[PDB]
Amino acid sequence: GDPAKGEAVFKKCMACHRVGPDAKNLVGPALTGVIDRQAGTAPGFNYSAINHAAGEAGLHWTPENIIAYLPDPNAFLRKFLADAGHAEQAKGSTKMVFKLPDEQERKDVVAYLKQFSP
């Protein structure tokens, strides 16, 4: 992944997300420090039941998980919960109504996000 190109891909995320110092929540949660962060734990953000449940079931945003998540957020979260033994909690839908199908763009945007996490 190329972080330089990733910054350009992030333009597709900026309508709802912010990264950087004192980044604040908007329609979506701040993404500073999201790498390896438990899903649904960004301070002050009101998550969907499914995004919250996935984190409680063990979902952490490793680079691999973000890459697999971006092409279809709902599909990823529902499968994660089912595989974990919490299928009953995968009936809802995530508030993130956006998809990034292209593999390269996904790799690059994740490379960019890694710059803002330990």
Ligand code: HEM
């Ligand atoms: C390549 C594009 C984007 C990236 C990298 C991205 C990444 C993420 C990630 C990793 C999460 C989970 C964060 C957490 O659990 O703390 C998330 C949640 C969310 N994103 Fe995005 N996002 C992108 C674009 C968008 C856009 C454009 C929108 C909406 C038009 C959006 C709205 C949201 C919302 C509302 C949530 C919370 C979902 C929920 O609570 O169910 N995202 N995003």
